[model samples]
Each structure stands twice: as structure tokens, then as C-alpha cells.
Target: AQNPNCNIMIFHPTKEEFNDFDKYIAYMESQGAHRAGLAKIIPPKEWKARETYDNISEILIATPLQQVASGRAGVFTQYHKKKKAMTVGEYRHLANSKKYQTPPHQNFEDLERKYWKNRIYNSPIYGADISGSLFDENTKQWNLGHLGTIQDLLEKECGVVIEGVNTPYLYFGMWKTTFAWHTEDMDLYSINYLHLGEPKTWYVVPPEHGQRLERLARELFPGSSRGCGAFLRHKVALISPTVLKENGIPFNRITQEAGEFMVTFPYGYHAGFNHGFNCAEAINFATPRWIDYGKMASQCSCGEARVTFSMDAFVRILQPERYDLWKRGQD
Candidate 1:
């Protein structure tokens, strides 16, 4: 029932290969890993992050609860705009219990009627900055903020710290919890690490199919499309793989387990659901090639409504020499 040709590339890097992170990723990109728009990296078994759920179990957070129309068989219909405030300890307790299990529905109408009444799943935690959360302090090796290339380019060169973009944000997930279909902010590359968990199933559409997927999304949700050019940025729509196949969009799927990394390329559209309770951290970064995509992304303001950082300021500061050359129409 799946597309055999669209399997996501997986890399099992040795200690040395994993040590030189950027080079390994660049080598993978050179070897056609970018063709899939996403790649999975399983670090050497000995590698481990120092932080876990126990470290921040007492941290209070406001988590969104999503309502699924037809239980696990349905897409997310809507979410509680007002988040539920609870500690990690309380949420873990509820998520581990069986109270939130999907209930059977008789028909589409029944599902629709129950949509507003049911809050079956906790959507993955979003935008929870980990600067002083101790979570960021211990995971330096794989911490997105401490990563070499991104820090050197964006922070060191540009001299700006955009929280949750260059800095890491923590996420907590449970069975059936989902992150909806969307590209990263400003179309930047994103690296997500599953510190500990069951597994996260990711569905990614390559950059080549990105526009087609957007068109399909528009056709499916015209209201949202008309509301904003980058409607998917809302992160509320969850189109199943079956719909993508029926629409002829090429896609790849991969399962990310604990102690693994998922690198999503610039302009790639991705979405996924969690298998069970898990903790994850993700951050966005940009390469020189990403500049073009960033500029193209500026044309749409729907998603850009919340600007994390200014691309113009970043480009001007990072590459004054190139900026001057462009101004004078010189290469």
C-alpha cells in the first residue's frame, strides 16, 4: 500500500562519521540524500544526550489538545485555541492512562457532531524555548543551538539569536499526537532529535513536489488558501498518505526512534504523528543555498506573519561583500 520508490534515506554513522556532523550531512546531500527532502541518522549506539523527561518533569507548560473527527482514522478537525495549563508530570500521568483512547464513531455525521465535544489527543508541545530549561545546557553535542555550521553562519556572522529557530525548542508527544503538514519557518532546514521515546513517523514531500502538495492543499482547503498564501503554515491540516498518493505527489516515510536525528531540507513539506510517549527537540538552520528559498518565502505573508528574524538584515550582515555586489549589479 506504500510507494516502494519513495522510502526515506537512512544513514547509520560511525562515531567518527557522526563527529564531523556538517561534513557528513553535506556528503549525504552530495550523494542524493537531498532528493528525498529528508534523511534519518542513527548515531553510534554509544552516543547519548544527558537530558531526559525526569529533568523537566515538574516544568509547567500550556499544551494544545486536538479533536480528531473519526478517532485514529480521521484527521485533526480543530484544536482548543486556549491551551490547557499543566505540568509535565500531570500531562505524562494523563497521557500514560487509557482515558484518552480513541472512541468508535458511527458515521461522518456522528464524527462531526462529536468533534467539538471530544479532545482525544495532546498535540505535540510547540514553541517551548529551552534556553535556561537545563535541557539545552546538557545536550550540546546534538543541540541545534550549539551546532557548528548554523551557529557560525547565523549567530557568529549575523550576530543575532532567534529563539526556536537557531535555538532548540522542546516537544513532548504521546500516542496519536501529531504535528501537521507544513514546511519550516522561512523555509529553512530543520533538524529534530528524539531524545527518548517510542518512535515518530515522518511523512515528507521533496522540494520538487512542494508546489504540487501546496496546490493539493489549496484544492482541499480553499478557505484557508484564500485566507493566506502559505495556508499550511497554520499547522492545522493533516492530509493522510493515501490522499497524497491519490493526488500523485511523491513522498517518503521514515520512523525516527530514540537517540536518532531527522534532518529536513529547506523547502521540504513534512508532517507526522507519534507512536507513544516521547521527548524531542528541534531547531531550524540555513545554508547559503537556503538564501534563495528564504527570499522566495517572503512573497507569502500568511506564514511570515510572525517573523522570527529579518532575512534582509541577516543577509546584509552576513555577507556585506555580496550585498554590495548585488546592489551594483555585479557578480
Candidate 2:
């Protein structure tokens, strides 16, 4: 939830798209990201908060447990380079050499902080304004750097863009991305696939009836709690299932009823929680977006890889043992 304050909503414009739900469901099941208990625990929604997942609700969708799973390719390396202010290839190589400690097992941030503190804290080109927006071709990219080093991702992929919003080109990470319970320019809906260990997100708003949570943020959280931002020190929790929804909208509307939390940020007033303990991962999907609108209008494709293998990976790792599979790859 980069823009902690901004809530999201998803949309399904056409009947055919929703009809494709079974297609993707079967596809993801073949890949195995869904588990018997996953949908019961967490849900993945296609149409923002417009509807709910109708099939298997008793699933976790974790790897190994789910029997099918996948991950964002080079995500660690790519993200690492940006965070550390290094190169993508550099982080990629570094990731393989035992230099970096994976999270969920150890204090991933602690190691990065104490050892690599200077890199993250004092990145020259990646200062606060563009903290997650740094373009250091010769720097590291993780926190969870996807591909390798920052430079590699910039040069090979993120350095340029050719579409609307160009979010892939935007800054990455909580530090680089700033949002509070109260956000700005609240519109649209969101959804996500939470992975790794279940992380806790604390949100105070849901985008229903065009409501934003920024007011709640400012009212609930006065100033920057951690000197980071206003809601930095807010005590939030994520339990077993999605806890809120309103006006049929959600910030991350994975499953309509639950499985994923919902945050509404219309009028730029939004606040939400995160599931990261040191670090946690969640797959984000937003709707009512230009792409969603386009889809509604029968326009261009979202261009997400057709039949994504990563979705399969999510199914494969549907168990606790499969949480860190993000580290496995061509290495």
C-alpha cells in the first residue's frame, strides 16, 4: 500500500471479462496459487470491490501449500537496486552471494539497516522526494530488489515507459512512496494477492460512496508518528480475513467479502495499514483505472503477461514452507 492514504477500487466493465474469471481461476489453479484454506483466509478479486470470488473460498494460495504459485520475475533484484541505490545486476549478483539476508526468517530490515544503512538512508540521487523513485543505474535495487541491481532494472526495463500513469516508472517502496490514512486524489479501487507471511494492514477508510480516508488520518494520527509520516506509528492489525467494505469499493479488493482489506480514498482522505513485519509482500491490482476503463470499453490489453506463470507459482507455494520461493530462480 504505497499511498497508505489512497484507497483503490476495481471494476469489471464487460460480462465477458467476468466470464473469463473461470478461465483464470483454472489457469491459476493449474499453477497452484490457490489453496483449500486460502480463499477461506484471503481472496483474490478481479473486479475491484464490484464483486466477490465465487469459487473455492477455503484457500490460502501460498506456495507449496497451494500446489501452484509464481512470483514477479527479478522483482527482488529490481527493487533492491532502487532501495540500495545500486545497480540491478549488482544486486542480482549480490543476492546470490549470501550478502543479503532474506526476510520472514531474520530481521531483513535490520541487516539492511545496520549493514547497508548508509545506502538506503543517504542515497544521493534517491532522496526523500524521489526516494522510491530513484533511477540509479549503478546502484542496488532491493529492499526486495527484483531482478538484480538498480542499474540493471533501469537500463533493461524501468528506465523508460510508454503508457498512461507509468506507475512502473514511479518510485517504489513505502519509504519512497508516501501516503497516510488520509491520502490525496482518492479514486478507483484496488485488489491484491497477499503472499509470504500474512502481514497486518491497518486502514481506517474504504472508498464507498466516494469517501476518502484522509480526514481519518489527520484526525486519528496527528503528526508524523515515526518522523516518517503522520500514521507511521499507527497501531494497526490484519487478522484472518478482509475486515471492511463500503459502497462496494475497496482499496485492495481481493475478494469482495473478505480475504483482502479495503480502503476508500475519495476526496484524498484515506488511511490504511500494512502487513509488513520488517517486510511482507502483497500483489496489487487496481481497477476503474484507465486500463480498467479501456477494458470496459473493449480497448487494449492490460498487457500483464498472458497466462502469467507467476500466478501458477502462487498456487505451488500454498504452504508455509513455500513462502520464500521468491528467492528461487535461474540462480
Candidate 3:
């Protein structure tokens, strides 16, 4: 944040330079450092995904020498912004708005063959809690593979610890700030690590807080159940540390040197975005519970179900203060 000292691009060391961890450590030790460099063991496909820098802010975000070499000419245009929101029903109306006999996010790979038919019913998981694109054509099924992982992948997920049910979470960017502002779902935490050039994160909100957020969203967007009014709640910051320490998650000493913190406030709504940078993590996760277990039995027949929250209900569901200031917005 202060005058930058390093290059924006954290370069990939040459193969010979990183032949092994021990060799890298010897080099560090020679330089009077103690830690060894971790190997960059990236997945097969991801090797190609790494780029020098794809963000528009790279020119301004670049380290000093590079920014100067570029003649200080910014590559992106700073322009007026336009924003809008839509309602669930209105959004649905605009959706194919047709009766589709086929299930979405499904592989009717063959319209004639192995196709599954899904009907509409309602439950806690029923309605779209926040304003968003529920699902898309490119997707045929939910990534159940990612379930049981942290809810949001925003930068805030780091340092904050999550365990059992209740824990501290720190949150930044859009959704985390609006965590309690919307659905009161599972208890989770995130650090408020705000920065530009993030990505669109995913989250799942509970019923109560989701209802309030939706209610306020209706007021803000002025369209009934449009569910797209969340962009406005991105101003506040939040925290929860005791629960983190209790849960064994910590706001490590380094977070502050980096200007970040973790938190936990139950009836927690999960959300995140990386603004498309080197940062990583998931958004909106559900820890298995008695109520969630019920989904195994009556879930299919019910079509959909949802979990809601309220201030009192939120406090009741939590393990402890998680930290003091039951409901505080940190800067």
C-alpha cells in the first residue's frame, strides 16, 4: 500500500533456479533468510492459465520501474459507471419464460435418451436469496465437488479460521459487507480485504437475513423481488476474532502488515470476488447439520427448501459472541 518496493509480477523462478526446495532454501540461507520457497505445483490445465497480468489496472498496479517504463500512460479508460438491478419474478419473466420440460444444469446430453425431469417445489433452498445469475447454460450441474469447502473464495477467507459450526470471519468487497444485510444462513467468517481487480464470488444466504437483504434490496432497486440490489451494500467492513481464536482460526500477525482481518457473525451470508488477481478461495459453503441432514429424506419430494434468519434467531444459533460486538461493522 505504501510506495511499492517489489515488481507487480511475482515471477516464476527458472526451472534450474527452483530445482528443489532444499536448493532454494540454501540460496535463501545464503541470503540470511530462514524460510524455503514452496514449489509451484500447479495443476495440469492451470499451467496455461497463468498470465503475466490480465487485469486492466496492471499499468497502474505495476511496480515502480515497470510503471515508469510504460511512460505512466494508463491502459484503461476511467469512465462513468452504470448499474441496475432486477427482481426474481421479473427476472424469471425475462428468463426463457417458457415452460421447459427439461431440468437445467442437467445433461439431457441426448434430448431423447438419458435425461432427468425435475419439477418445481419450494423450500429453504427455493428462492434466489440475493440478486444474481442463479445458473447458466454452460453449467449442467452444480459443482458438488466444491461443497464442504469454505463458502466464499474472496481474499478475505485467508487467516480467518472456520471449524465445527461457529467461527470468526472477515469479509471485504461486496457480499461479506452485506453478510448480515441478507440471508441468515450457516455461520461463517471472512476477513475484510478490499482491493480492486477482484472476481465475481459465489455465496449462499440463509432465510432470515436473506429476507431482510431482499426486502431492503426491493426498496433500493424499486422492483418487486428483483434480487439484484446488492451492489450498493459494499461500503462497510466486518470482523470476528475471538471465535476465530477459539475455533483455532487466527487473524495471524501478518494480516495487519498486509492490511487484513478475519471475522465471524452468524446467520452468516457468504460471498466473495477476487477482482481477477493472484488471490484464491471459494464462496458460500454449507456445513452439514441436522436440518441439512433432513434434505436427504424429504428434499427431493419438496422441490426446494430454504434456511432463514433473524437477529434474535441469529444470536440463538451462534455458539458465543464468536467475538464481542455481536453485530459490528469494522472499518
Candidate 4:
């Protein structure tokens, strides 16, 4: 949670596009950056009233133990670029316990007044789940960066809302912590904002070509059955641009810098790894163009990849003012 007075801000104002969700989508599509490309967004002066996550002790000081089980231990962890698996509960205990004081395990109290600390690095500890949104005491909502964005409007219309839609998730990555290839559920669009940190390198492929990329990944692994593409199935896989190029598929490569935002369009396949220590916030959103994908999102069920919210209820709960916009194009 953020201080009540803190509000996130964006820099690099563009007359080309407003912060409105639909406008952002239209602008991205027009620029051909939405389908399978990346755009850089800059924010200035840091979000006001920000604190916590400034260091290890402060961030976990008040965090509930169960939060670690659900958000952190559930994800993959890499130690020294090698998979080091553990249960959520186990990981939680280790994080809070005083032992395990070797490499990668620094005395929590010994940690300096650090900012943008990576959860795992060269030691045995892997990445940790440290994603959270800033809360606004006045609105009783997460401090959404824009006025008319999907989450802002949805919350305004429906009161409380569903996950992955406008609800931003935070991330803290150390060296080699990787997010493998995947698309936003139901093909919804997503924007990943690096609050502050080192760079995150990325390999992005268009959704249509994701299957082709999957095919080539099999050639790289060579062990998986032809029907089973192991790379995408694994928790984290390294499918470089060179390998993708050898297979004749074009992909975008980028190293996201701190204070920059990366926008992933619907059905975009993005995978990336952290360089040093980094923290990033990501949220999923939809525009008028999203309804088509909502149909498919309604039926998905692959791990945490399903659309858990109901679109019917979402449309019905939408504010009366934008009711026309809701069904304007898709209906």
C-alpha cells in the first residue's frame, strides 16, 4: 500500500494520445505498436507519497504471511539461473526466519537503506512476489494513473471489481528472474510500468505467430514430443531472438529501462528476464476492441491464465454514461 497522498504520474505528454484506455489502444494500433511491439513511457519525480518497498524489512514488515503463499511462492524461482523450487509456505518461513545466512541470504537487518532491491540474485534465493498497487484513502481504491481508463471507469461504475482488469500487480526481480511467454487473458491489453530499477530484457512475438514460435522452441529443446512444446509449458524458458530468427519468425527485442512503461497489446506473446534488481507494476485493461477476445477469455482455464471475471456483469455494471461506448463497435 502507498501513502494516502501519493498519486502516480506519467511524463512525456503526447498530443497524439490521451490517457484514456480506448484512446491509448487506438493510438497504439495506428502506430502499429499494439499488435506485437513495444513503446516506452516516462514518468517523473517518482510517484508522490511513495514509501514501503524501499527495503526488504519495510516491505515485509506488515505483509500478511498468506500473501506470500498466494502471490510469491506460487511462481517459479531461479537460483543462479537454475531452477530452485520450493513451496509457498516453505519460502515464507525462510524469508522470515533468521537462518539460511549464506550467499544470496543477507541479514535482513543488514540490508542498507536500499531502493529497488531484487528479491533473488546470484544466491539460492530466487525471485519473490512483491507486486502491489498504491491505495488511495480518499477514493478507497488503488491509485489508477488515468481518469477514464478501464479500471478507473469500471470501479466507478461497478463499485468493487475483478482482478487482472485494471488491478495492477507489482514485481521485484533479481538477476535471472524470468517471466516466460504468455499473453494477457482473453487477449486483453496490458501495460507494464517499471517503477524504478535496472533494465528488463524482453523477447516479444505476435499472438498469431506465438504458435510458430512454440514450434521453433521445440527444435531448440529437441527433447519434447512434437505435440508437446516444452518451452512455453515450462515455468521459464529462454527462447532468444537469434533462435526465433533462425526459424524465420520476426520478434521484437527490447531492454526496458527504469521509469519506462511497456505496453503489450491483446494476444501479444512477451517473455523477459531481469538484469540487476528491479521493480515493475503491470495491469491488464480492455478497450472497445476487447469484447471479441472476452468471448474466448470466458472459456480459458490454464493455471492463472483464465478470465476470472464475468463480462456480462461487467457490462451491466458499467457506468450509464459510457454504456454506448461499451457496445459501440463490437455489438
Candidate 5:
């Protein structure tokens, strides 16, 4: 049963329109697309898919093997009890193997027994940095790092290279492998591109409903929320959209197909799972408007120390030049 209100805004842009990433996003913002917190962009059909995974087939990576249990719709962070190291080819082979297609445990007792017996099932590769290993850097269209937009202002102005933030990070996903609800670090914007394979399903809460969702999270997971305002950053909790809808929170669902791009707005809380075997890349970016959000996020009383770049330094560097522009414009 599809919810009528859960429709995420979808944009189909021409190759020319998509080139100006900033203008396209501004236009989308003007159309109130940000209210959904997530939007899908289908690039022009003329654009060819880049060869992302073929070159990295032999790369060895460690991935968390997620434990499955009945009534758990998504994988929880705490349920990742073991890590498995394998070559990309080996992982892909196992991901598509019939052994992995076995049904999940039907009861909590069975799940507990499996957990105690050290049984593992799902393994999804995440946070794999492929910036240097990309097949081709010349192809800028849909490139997470080389968007060439105002959203890249932080990197353009600061020369700061934060892996997974400004640099592209690759993710390998299979059925039921999930990323829990959370906003981007420092409340920055993020764009994810599906290089190939199956579609990834996403659920996003609007910025307006962010507080409600946080409050609900605190109420549901008091232990996790205790003394930490940004407890969601722990990435342990997975709340279903059904629960969100029942609580009257505004949320939307979207499925990102191969060759499609998904942009998450600043402060937008999003979480999702892969439908099947897939490979995707994502990176965080910041526009001029993100400065305020960045400052506020830095000042958050979350108790936990935030591991982020210095926004103060970024602002200080821009102050002199921006002030000069302001003075010249006044003339």
C-alpha cells in the first residue's frame, strides 16, 4: 500500500540544465522541493554510465556482517556483530549466491541462538573511498566530487578535502542492508549517485518535521538518547515510515534507480535500504546557505565531541573577501 503523501519530488533535467548544478538546485528550492528533504534527479539519457566497479574488483575491503531477526525490517547498527574481509569480486559473488537468499530467523529465540552461536548473514560494503580509483575522472557529469557548482564552494574556497564529505565514497549493498536515519555531518547537503545494479529505497523526513522525529527517537530509545542531543548520529536506530506516519510526522519515500542521482537537503533526516545487489557513491557538499546550518550544528550541545572540519576558519577566510565585495557593490 503506497501512501499518497509519501511521494518524493522527481526532476528530469536535460544535459545542459543538469550541468549548472547550482542553478538546477536553486530552481528546485524555489519550487519548494526542499520541503520533501529528498529529491531524485534523472539525468539526460544521452549520458553514458561510467565503469566504476570493474577496475576495483580485486580490491580487498572489510564489511560488517549483519545479523537478521524476525520483525526487524531494517538492519540495526548494534546487530552488526562481526566483520568479514573479502575481495570486491568475492563479496559480489557471495552477495548474489543462493546461500544468502535463505529466510531470516522467524523468532527472537532463534535470533538470540544464532547470535550466541556467532552466525552471520548479510554483509554490505560501506564507506569505501574510491576517489583515487575511479575509472575516469574526465567525465564530470554526475560525478559526486566534480559537480562544479556553488555547492562545492567549501572545497573551492577552503581547499579542504574531507573524505566521504567532499571526496566520493563508494557503497556496495545487497537485500535488506540498511543505513539508519541521520543527517549529514555538519548539516551539509549530500548527493548520492547509483553507479549500477539494483535500485536503493530511501525514506526522508522534511526539515520541518526533523524536531518531531528527533523527539520521537528520544522517546523510543531513551537509553541511546540519554545525554546526547544527536543520538541519531550513533546510527543504531531504525524507525519505519509506518511508525513515522502514525506519529503524524511528514515523510516521503523514493526509489533511486541505476544512473539516477538523489540529493539530500541540509538538515534533512534520511534513512534507507538497498533493494538488492547494488553499487553507489555519495559525497557531502555545502552551499553558501549551509554556513548558518554548519555554525548551528557545531554549537549543538550533543555532549559527544564532533569530528568535523573547522567552520570558523572557513568563515574567517571568507570574511575579508566578502566584505570587499560588499563595499564595492555599495559604490
Candidate 6:
């Protein structure tokens, strides 16, 4: 957002930088403070895949109910977003319940081989009723990263908390647990850091095509089935590279690995699904760019810019620090 002419780039950070979570986070915060940053971890031919729910089975299934008992839990279900209804326990049960060979075409073991490939399944796990600082801890483990650091600085500065924006959301994705194509509320940028478990495939179209896809999305409701017109209802949209390619839409796909981060841009159309079970945490923030597009999006057909009131928020926070020299009449 600092420079509209600047393009968002995708690259792999050096092992020394990426491995040092503090430097990686700092570099990302500077370049991608307002835009998306897509990167891959190097050296590893392939990220180790974990069985769905294998790495995070206990806390995911156990703690959600625990939070509920303490009256500290929030409800999340893909039933409305994906067409299936079940609690976290039920969702966990279903994830490991069967071998999972639907449509009677592919055998269970046959399907398992290419389980990494994107499938035409609407399996949803609209999870994350648990709330805790997974990222905060991970960052600390690495060089005592950013102590007293808060992801969404505006929220803390503004003293207003918004769901999904300022809040650090914890997610447990199983099978085809998917998030549908949508821009972050108020056109803020979001960074999703996968903690562990199965790798996820992300479909991200840039901000330029955001409106185009949103226009297409206007035609479908939330419960629509899978396929071209199905993403609205399925939570997991079938918007793969092939589909976008046939339509001549440009996009980027990253099967994100554990210990990696996916930074989304302002007003970008992005969505993804887990290959299997996984745990992830994400939060949203805005940079200098949000001031304009945030206003534009709010006026556009997508929805109101829920957080744009803070368009002034971020500017005020950074202005003095950026141009404080002027206060001394020193240009």
C-alpha cells in the first residue's frame, strides 16, 4: 500500500532468514505490511505430510469442548458454509472414521496416493473455536521473537476488537476443510501461518481480479453445490488453476507447508483447503494502501468495509513516526 506502483512478489527466503522466524517476520512486515507475500520453503523436496488429525487430534477435539465448559468458546461450523453440520468432536470423528472413498469410483487406497491432489469434494471443517496464542509462542521460541508483539497493530492501537480481523483465529482443518473465495473484511491483508499437519492448497487471485470474481460470485448463494457456481455454498470452492486457466483468469497456487506463512494482499480473492488434517492460525492487518481500496470496496457490491473507519487509524499511527523529522522543521 505504501507504493501502489509496487507489485507483490513471490520468492523463497534464504534458509538463514526463513529459519530465523524473527527476521522473516520483520522482512514480511516491512514489504508486505499492506500487500500479499507468497513464499515457499527451500531445501525440502516435499514437506512431510501428517495424517489428518494425527498431529493435532487431542487438543483440537478435546479443548474446544473444554472452552465451551468455561463459557469461553466461540461457535464455528461449516454446515452453513459447507453443507454439513457437526460439532468439533463429531467433525474429528468423521475425519478419522472411514477410509474415505466416495462416488464408488476410486478405491480407498487408490485415492490415498493422490490425496495431495485437489479433489471435487466439499468436505468442510469450519473449525477454530479454540483461542490461544500459537503464533505468539512460536515466534518466541525463535530468538525470543517480537516480545509484546501484536499482529494487528491497529486494533490494539484503536482499542476496538473485531472478529476475524483483530482476533487471532486458531483452526483445525481435516480432510477437505476449506475456506471459500472471499476478500478479508475491509480489504485488510491477512497472514495465515500453518502450525503443523497436512499441507494446504491455496488459490489466490490478485486484487485486480478481485472485483471480477466477486461479480461472478454475486450469482451464487452460500449453500450452492460444488463446481463453477458451487463455491458460494460449498465453503471449499472448486476454483483451481485449471478452472481459472480455462476462463483466462490469472492466479497463484501454493500448497503451503507447515512452518510456512501465507500472506494475503488487500482486496485479493483468496481461498484454500487442507489436503488432510492440519492446524493453522491467522490474523488481518492493513497498511498505507488500505485507505483508498478499503473505501472503494466498502462502496462496492461485496459488502461494507467493516474496518475502514480505521483507514485513518493506521495513517495516524505511522505518520508521526515516518515524518517526525518535519516536526523539528528539518524536512
Q: Write down the lDDT of every candidate, Cα atoms only.
A: 0.64, 0.25, 0.24, 0.48, 0.65, 0.48
Q: Please, what's the RMSD in Å of model 2?
A: 19.6
TM-score, one value per model:
0.76, 0.26, 0.21, 0.57, 0.75, 0.57
Q: Would you give me the overall lDDT of model 4?
A: 0.48
**Cα lDDT for residue 70, candidate 6:** 11
Model 2 stretches with alpha carbons more than 4 Å out: 1-179, 183-186, 206-269, 275-331
Distance from true location, Cα of 101 in model 1, Å: 5.3
How does residue 290 of candidate 6 score in lDDT?
A: 51
Best-fitting candidate, scored by TM-score: 1
The better candidate by TM-score, 2 or 4, is: 4
Flag regions of model 5 displaced more than 4 Å.
Answer: 1-7, 51-54, 63-79, 102-135, 148-165, 298-331
- Could you tell which candidate, 2 or 5, scores higher by TM-score? 5
Candidate 3 least-lDDT 10 residues = 63-72
Model 1 whole-model lDDT (C-alpha atoms):
0.64
Poorest stretch of ten by lDDT in candidate 1: 125-134
Q: What is the lDDT of candidate 5?
A: 0.65
Model 3 segments more than 4 A misplaced: 1-210, 224-266, 270-280, 288-331
Residue pairs with backbone atoms closer than 3 Å in model 6 (clashes):
52-277, 222-233, 224-233
lDDT of 3 by residue, 122-224 (tens): 0001111221121223422221122234322211323333333222221112111112122223333222222222222222333223344334334433432
Deviation in angstroms for 170 in model 3?
Answer: 16
Residue 240 lDDT (model 5) = 72
Query: Runs in model 1 with CA error above 4 Å?
Result: 1-7, 51-53, 63-77, 101-140, 149-165, 298-331
How many residue pairs of model 5 clash at the backbone?
0
State the lDDT of candidate 4 residue by residue for 1-331, as single tens digits. Answer: 2112211222353533333445655654555555454455553343331454344323431222111111122122221232345443444345444432222425322221121133332242433434455333342112344324565545554466644333556665544445656666445677776756556777677655666766665655465324332334333445544456667876766677775667776666787666545667677776666555544432211332213344434544433343354344224
